[PDB]
Design a protein around this ligand. Structure first.
Ligand SMILES: *[C@@H]1O[C@H](CO)[C@@H](O[C@@H]2O[C@H](CO)[C@@H](O[C@@H]3O[C@H](CO[C@@H]4O[C@H](CO)[C@@H](O)[C@H](O)[C@@H]4O[C@@H]4O[C@H](CO)[C@@H](O)[C@H](O)[C@H]4NC(C)=O)[C@@H](O)[C@H](O)[C@@H]3O)[C@H](O)[C@H]2NC(C)=O)[C@H](O)[C@H]1NC(C)=O
Ligand SMILES: *[C@@H]1O[C@H](CO)[C@@H](O[C@@H]2O[C@H](CO)[C@@H](O[C@@H]3O[C@H](CO)[C@@H](O)[C@H](O)[C@@H]3O)[C@H](O)[C@H]2NC(C)=O)[C@H](O[C@@H]2O[C@@H](C)[C@@H](O)[C@@H](O)[C@@H]2O)[C@H]1NC(C)=O
Ligand SMILES: *[C@@H]1O[C@H](CO)[C@@H](O[C@@H]2O[C@H](CO)[C@@H](O[C@@H]3O[C@H](CO)[C@@H](O)[C@H](O)[C@@H]3O)[C@H](O)[C@H]2NC(C)=O)[C@H](O)[C@H]1NC(C)=O
Ligand SMILES: CCCCCCCCS[C@@H]1O[C@H](CO)[C@@H](O)[C@H](O)[C@H]1O
Length: 602
């Protein structure tokens, strides 16, 4: 027989319907299953008709694995899936959230909060473009990005993954989507999935919905807000994602008014699917269905029933696929979940796969391997890092000479602080490891290295991580650059009620600035208590989590470019003010949203 779904020249909808109509229940439930590479085997993938794999944070074939190693890994999994009766290719997903950040030698872009400071959606589109290439360099077809959370409380450990507390800025930054996926056609129907082809990846608007609105910024917690506030703060950017053809949506761990997002049929089916007309696939978060119950995973049968009935299409299991498949099969066999629900989930998954070209190009392109860490992409990350910097102070009094920009030629200068020569710290979370890490974890340029690469040959550069006051006073320095801030964190590990930087940080700034005039570079995922750092410093820069390209920092410090970044978030006077956002009744910021001092290029 002629087999329509295998015919590349046929419309997606026709191919979807043709394939669906041939599939067994096992093959259907298989498509709905995403498993970790760590539990995947050729037999497992074949026998269970698995639809998707992922790497969680730090799930890598080897430390320091090359782009080709990643391709061979992904292709090995694909070969197994292609060997099934129907040969449905798997889609491989990864958190490429500021570059292809799990991968050694990948370009690491500034985290979202710093991107929000740039107010440059086209820069963000270009980052999406570069990121698609570096993800494809590793054979991967699907990035779990953008996080379009609107972080309404900086005590949240994922506040750095939010472009802004202002939904309008988050909305503008949805340009990451057509960067990652390609621009949609002129004719395009809002809510339809889209990926241009083999040089682009499927994107994922996450985490639906109100992940940034949890009480006390507690990760995965309850968002307590009326429908009006949900719809005008947390929802708007999902509609922009629909208009730009986002391929997938991941559901949030968080609850809305006490209802688990992973169990909310009204929002997932009633709103996302039936109102916004989303035609791509809906994916769970990692063990998201498990966490519907308390304790998590204590009634997995209910977890499966509630999530699948709510309208989720693909489950990021990610480990115990046998239990998931068995339980879902039982629920379908007993009529508790109807076939129509299974068929809808599989329709959407196949729609995305056929649309993106996956049946035509299921294997990696070895010619793409060299896209990883490509210097052009690093130049872009460097541009983004510079554009993200917010100058908060440039002179102690109105009558002082502005410290920045600093001269490249001076007899002797000091670089200091725990964050001055620490690549892992300047990248933050989701870099190499899930939680990020310390030190030289990848290819990059620290602030110290950037300083050495920038200054006149006659400029002596001294590094001291934590020098005492006497060392500085006795040093014969013209000025100092001192970099301090937060340690890398991700998700609940970053939840923080006091928002004060670890020591030594302030003490180093005080010891340094007390002896010579100083530019303080603050590395953080969010506003932190800053008055004491401000009081000590001649100039102070909020550099956020600028990524691998530390020369973006010195590009502004030394006046190659003027400072242009503006706060995408409110800077609070103290944590007991929180939550506190632009527009609030009792708004009393240290720095308002949109604040930023400027310099001009020298
Ligand atoms: C305000 O609230 C914050 C959030 O609760 C507090 O920060 C957190 O405190 C807890 C409890 O003390 C820390 O948990 C401990 O972590 C120890 C390991 O050391 C850490 O490693 C983590 C990554 O593995 C980092 O994120 C941490 O920052 C810390 O790293 C070290 O920190 C040193 C101090 O500056 C520094 O000298 C080292 O160089 C650095 N090393 C590295 C690898 O970067 C464990 O041994 C303990 O058992 C315990 O679990 C928690 O880590 C910490 N921070 C984060 C980001 O989660 C904060 O204390 C509080 N502030 C005030 C004013 O009270
Ligand atoms: C010295 O420093 C300031 C930097 O703050 C320069 O003025 C600023 O220039 C921006 C772009 O050149 C202005 O445009 C705004 O930003 C976005 C881009 O993200 C634009 O699309 C949008 O239309 C905005 O209006 C910005 O408004 C402006 N800031 C202010 C308040 O003056 C300045 O540049 C010079 O003057 C400005 C007014 C423009 O005419 C520039 O073309 C011109 O270069 C810098 N001075 C010099 C000589 O470089
Ligand atoms: C939002 O965050 C709060 C604070 O973490 C969550 O409440 C906490 O829920 C856990 C259960 O998952 C409670 O721990 C349990 O306590 C019981 C009672 O003694 C014990 O038997 C268990 O072994 C377990 O340790 C915890 O007490 C509770 N925290 C408090 C004090 O309120 C809340 O559930 C979160 N809400 C959402 C929607 O996620
Ligand atoms: C050691 C494992 C401990 C589990 C703790 C919860 C981690 C969930 S993360 C979750 O993972 C997805 C894929 O990795 C990301 O896309 C999401 O944005 C993120 O919310």
């Amino acid at each position: 027989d002629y087999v329509l779904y295998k015919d590349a020249t046929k419309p997606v909808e026709d191919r979807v319907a043709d394939l669906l109509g041939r599939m067994t229940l096992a093959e259907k439930i298989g498509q709905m299953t995403q498993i970790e590479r760590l539990v995947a085997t050729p037999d497992v993938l074949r026998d269970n008709f698995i639809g998707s794999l992922l790497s969680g944070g730090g799930s890598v074939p080897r430390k320091g694995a090359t782009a080709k190693e990643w391709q061979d890994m992904v292709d090995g999994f694909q070969k197994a899936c292609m060997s099934t009766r129907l040969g449905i290719p798997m889609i491989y997903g990864i958190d490429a959230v500021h570059g292809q950040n799990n991968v050694y030698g990948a370009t690491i872009f500034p985290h979202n909060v710093g991107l929000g400071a740039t107010r440059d959606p086209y820069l963000v589109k270009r980052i999406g473009e570069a990121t698609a290439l570096e993800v494809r360099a590793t054979g991967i077809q699907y990035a779990f990005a953008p996080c379009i959370a609107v972080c309404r409380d900086p005590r949240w450990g994922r506040c750095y993954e939010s472009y802004s507390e202002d939904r309008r800025i988050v909305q503008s930054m949805t340009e990451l989507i057509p960067g990652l996926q390609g621009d949609v056609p002129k004719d395009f129907t809002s809510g339809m999935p889209f990926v241009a082809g083999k040089n682009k990846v499927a994107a994922c608007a996450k985490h639906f919905v109100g992940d940034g609105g949890t009480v006390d910024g507690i990760n995965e917690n309850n968002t307590i807000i009326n429908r009006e506030g949900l719809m005008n703060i947390h929802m708007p950017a999902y509609k922009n994602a629909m208009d730009k053809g986002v391929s997938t949506v991941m559901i949030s761990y968080s609850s809305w008014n006490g209802v688990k997002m992973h169990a909310n049929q009204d929002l997932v089916t009633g709103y996302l699917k039936d109102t916004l007309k989303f035609k791509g696939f809906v994916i769970s978060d990692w063990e998201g269905i498990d966490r519907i119950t308390t304790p998590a995973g204590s009634d997995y049968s209910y977890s499966v029933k509630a999530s699948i009935l709510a309208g989720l299409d693909m489950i990021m299991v990610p480990n115990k696929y046998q239990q998931f498949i068995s339980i879902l099969t039982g629920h379908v066999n007993g009529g508790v979940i109807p076939m129509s629900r299974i068929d809808d989930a599989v329709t959407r998954i196949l729609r995305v796969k056929f649309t993106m070209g996956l049946f035509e190009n299921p294997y990696a392109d070895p010619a793409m391997a060299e896209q990883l860490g490509k210097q052009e992409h690093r130049d872009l990350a460097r541009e983004a890092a510079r554009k993200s910097l917010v100058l908060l102070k440039n002179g102690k009094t109105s009558t002082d000479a502005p410290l920045l920009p600093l001269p490249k030629k001076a007899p002797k200068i000091l670089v200091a602080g725990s964050h001055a020569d620490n690549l892992g710290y300047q990248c933050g979370g989701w870099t190499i490891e899930w939680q990020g890490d310390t030190g030289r974890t990848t290819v990059g340029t620290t602030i110290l290295e950037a300083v050495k690469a920038a200054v006149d040959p006659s400029t002596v550069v001294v590094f001291a991580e934590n020098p005492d006051a006497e060392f500085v006073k006795s040093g014969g320095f013209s000025y100092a650059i001192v970099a301090v801030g937060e340690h890398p964190y991700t998700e609940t590990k970053g939840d923080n009620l006091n928002l004060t930087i670890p020591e030594p940080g302030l003490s180093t700034v005080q010891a340094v600035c007390g002896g010579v005039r100083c530019a303080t570079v603050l590395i953080s995922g969010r506003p932190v208590v800053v008055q004491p750092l401000l009081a000590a410093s001649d100039a102070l820069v909020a550099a956020w989590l600028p990524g691998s390209e530390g020369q973006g920092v010195t590009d502004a410090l030394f006046g190659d470019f003027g400072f242009t970044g503006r706060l995408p978030r409110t800077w609070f006077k103290s944590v007991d003010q929180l939550p506190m956002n632009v527009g609030d009744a009792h708004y009393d910021p240290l720095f308002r949203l949109g604040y930023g001092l400027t310099t001009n290029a020298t």
